[PDB]
Amino acid sequence: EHLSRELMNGATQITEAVLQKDLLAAAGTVLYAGAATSDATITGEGSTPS
Amino acid sequence: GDINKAMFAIVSFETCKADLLKEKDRYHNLNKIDWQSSAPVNEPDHATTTP
Numbered sequence: 001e002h003l004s005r006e007l008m009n010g011a012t013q014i015t016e017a018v019l020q021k022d023l024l025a026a027a028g029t030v031l032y033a034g035a036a037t038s039d040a041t042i043t044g045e046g047s048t049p050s
Numbered sequence: 051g052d053i054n055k056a057m058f059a060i061v062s063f064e065t066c067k068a069d070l071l072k073e074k075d076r077y078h079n080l081n082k083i084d085w086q087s088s089a090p091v092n093e094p095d096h097a098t099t100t101p
Contacts, residue, residue: 008092 062096 034050036042042050067085070077090100 004094005087005092
C-alpha cells in the first residue's frame with residue numbers, strides 16, 4: 001500500500017511539473033525587468049539591476 | 051459451484067462521509083479515517099468510471 005501510494009504521488013507531481021514548464025516556455029508576451037533584452041543579459045549588479 | 055456454500059464475499063464500493071454519517075450509531079472510528087489518502091485514484095483494483 002505504501003509503495004503504491006508513493007508511486008501515484010510521484011506520478012501526479014511529475015505531470016504537473018511537465019505542464020508548468022511547457023506553460024513557461026510557450027509564453028507570448030515577455031517582459032524583462034530592468035534593461036535586459038535576453039536571458040543572458042539579466043544582471044544583478046550595475047547602475048540598473050534587473 | 052454453489053453460491054450458498056461460499057464462505058465469504060468481498061465487495062468494494064464508493065461512499066462519502068455523509069453516507070456513513072446517515073447512521074452514526076452503526077459506524078465507529080470515523081475520526082481516524084484519512085479521506086485524502088483513500089481516494090479512488092490511489093486504489094487501482096477498484097474498477098470505476100469516475101475520472
